[model samples]
Structures are given as structure tokens and as C-alpha cells.
Target: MRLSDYFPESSISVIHSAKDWQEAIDFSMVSLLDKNYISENYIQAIKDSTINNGPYYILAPGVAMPHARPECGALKTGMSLTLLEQGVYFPGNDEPIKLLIGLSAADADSHIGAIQALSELLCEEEILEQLLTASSEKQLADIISRG
Candidate 1:
């Protein structure tokens, strides 16, 4: 469930800005799609689901966890991160999301451990705040490993 096992260092990004939340989602997920952890259809699924429904991915203040089921084209179980210091705007609320966490699972239970780990990590103010200021992939990788 540790992030080091699910999220490669290359997939961690420090995005300074995004034209908007949709742009942020597309830009941030490039690594995962390129690596084949998820597929192009997975991206569309996220977009369609969010656009049709709501920003259900917003896990907490300044955090959004975008994901879809395996049938939506998930190639494997993995997670990626995008940290936006300037934040992105989500409709229906004024909160600026500073973190975008992308995830995909091979099946229902394959990612529960990783999901548990993330929930635990996000609960720590120190770690979450440190994530906001992480300047490089390695630094955030270190934080994820520690958590």
C-alpha cells in the first residue's frame, strides 16, 4: 500500500499552474497514460463522470482524487500525483484544489491497500502541508515512502 510500490517517481509532478481543473486533470495524468497504467478511455471516463455529475473526486480541502473503475480502461493498479500551488477551481464551490491525485485499479480489491495508505497519509497535517511545498519528484517520493 505504500506509495513507492504504486507510484513511480516519474509520475509525481509539481504543477505550478493549470488553465483550469480540466486542463490540470489532462496534463497531470499524462505520465500514467503514457506508462499504460491507465488508458485514454480512462481519461474520458473521468471527464464524462465529473462533467455529468460533480467533482466527486474532491477528497478534502485542496485535494482531489480522480479515479474510475477497471472496466473504464484501467490497465493496472497505480496512482499519480499533481501538486498545484496556485490551485484549480472546481465548480459549485470556491475552494481551490491544490492537489490532484489520480488512481486506477485492476479490480475492486487490488487498490484498497493503496487507498488506505493515501487516506492515512492525508490525515497528517505535516505530511499534507509538506506535499504542497515539495519541489521535486524525489522529495515527494520520500514523503510518500515515509508515510
Candidate 2:
């Protein structure tokens, strides 16, 4: 599965203004909720997950992949991408994160394919660079769509 497969045109935010990691997570969750991809409880679940998991949720230096059990908040299997122009810092590290990827799955199994694909994509520096530099939502979507 590709990022574009689960992230529809309505779910992507090209350039966001989140000032920190928490704000980025909040922004992404709102975007997902606005698109009707997640349930109302998403916000709390995200908060709980981050709070409970602490720095473990901070996968990379700046990036934090916030997620919770499917039943807690997911209304569907979906993903949303946000690019923060000013970047944000994760709890465990001070490196600034420009990209935020929010994922909501209806079940653990539902996200396997997309997660695998994304894992592969993240390993490629060129692709990640292209995504970071994408000028518009269309361009960002196109880059992912073609990937």
C-alpha cells in the first residue's frame, strides 16, 4: 500500500504552522477528524498514548508517530500527512521535525500494508527530501502518489 492509498486528497496538509510536536499531533488529528476518518475520541487517545508511552512514541530525533489502539478512536483506516514550515521538536530529542504523519487504523491488521510501504519509503533519503521540498499539496500528493 502506498501513502496515497489511505491518505485521500482531503486528508493531507501541505504546510502547517504547528509550533511543537504536541501541536503537530493535534493539528494532524483535527485534520483527520475534519475529514471524517477518525472518531471523536481520537484526541484523547492521542493524548493518552503520548502521555503513557512518553519518549517511546518519539521514533526519530524530531519525529513522533502517535497512535493508539484501533478501537479507542479510529473510525476508519486512514493516514494524514502534515508538513510544518517552522518544524517541531519531539520530547526525547531537540531535532526539529518538519513532517508529521498521523495514522488511524480500524484494526491492527488493517495498517500492515500501508505501514510496510511507508517504512520502505522512509528509508529512501531522496524521496524524503522531495516530500520535504514539495511546494504545494498537489505536488506533495503527486510525489507520494507516484512513489
Candidate 3:
């Protein structure tokens, strides 16, 4: 699925801050969990992996993709985007992450198309700038809809 196609308004959020990186990840997955796209086990696994392996999903200077292996309990393929205006610090990372793309794939291959669409959306400097500073859910949807 495409990023533009998969991201419902409910899956997008703009928040001021998070208590920590773990809280940030939880906030990012809230919509997905509510929609039944992922299980609680997936969230726990993502955090466990972060603690054991570090934040390997920090995809760019301002962006992070929080996810776990498919076996962690992905009920379906889905995505959520959270724009944290105040940013949050992850363990072992020097820079704060302003944007988080929470992802879940039922299996390995289903997420590739969405991730490709995500790359095209984020690779543009202007679009990335717009997303990083987005203040409302509407602004986030407007940017991704154009993806």
C-alpha cells in the first residue's frame, strides 16, 4: 500500500512532547492499536528490541521508524505518523527525533511498497521540512496525501 493510501487521519498526530522515547513509541502506535492493525505484543517487542539492539530505525536526522519483526504480532500491514514538535531523545542517539513513522507488516513483503512510498515522500527537502514542523493533523495529511 502507498503511504498516501494507508495513512488515515486517525493515524496521524501532532503532539508537543513525550516523557521519553518509549512513550514516544507508544503514542505513535496508539492509532494502530485502536484499529486492531497490531497487537500489544508488537509494542512490547519494539521497546524490547530498542533496549537490546538500540534505535536502529532512526531513518534520518529528524525521522524514526519504530517497528518490530512480523512475528511480534502484526495483525495487518499498517502505518502511523506522529509529528512531535518538541522532539524526543532515544537511547544512544545524540539528536532528538521530530517525526516518527510507526509501521507494522503482517509478513515481510507487504511493507515494502509502503516503505518505498514513504521514502519518496520524505526524500524531498521541502516536504520533509513541512512534515517536521507540522502543527496539526490536517497539515500532516495534506503533506502525505500529496505523496
Candidate that scores best on lDDT = 3
The digit string of per-residue lDDT tens for model 2 on 50-121 reads 556543444444444556678787878777767777676655445777766777888788867657766655
How accurate locally is residue 129 in candidate 2, as Cα lDDT from 0 to 100? 78
Per-prediction count of colliding residue pairs? 0, 0, 0
lDDT (Cα, tens digit) per residue for candidate 1, span 1-147: 556677855678877788876787776677789889888988888777777866776666887887877898988887888888798886754488887777778887876776887786676777778887788767777787885
Residue 13 displacement in candidate 3 (angstroms): 0.4
Candidate 2 runs further than 4 Å off: 52-64
lDDT of 3 by residue, 61-84 (tens): 878888777788888877888998
TM-score of 2: 0.82
- Deviation (Å) of 76 in candidate 3: 0.7
Query: Would you give me the overall lDDT of model 2?
Result: 0.68
Q: In model 3, what lDDT does residue 8 have?
A: 51
Global lDDT scores for all candidate models: 0.77, 0.68, 0.82
Better of 2 and 3 by lDDT: 3
Model 3: how far is 129 from its true place, Å? 0.7
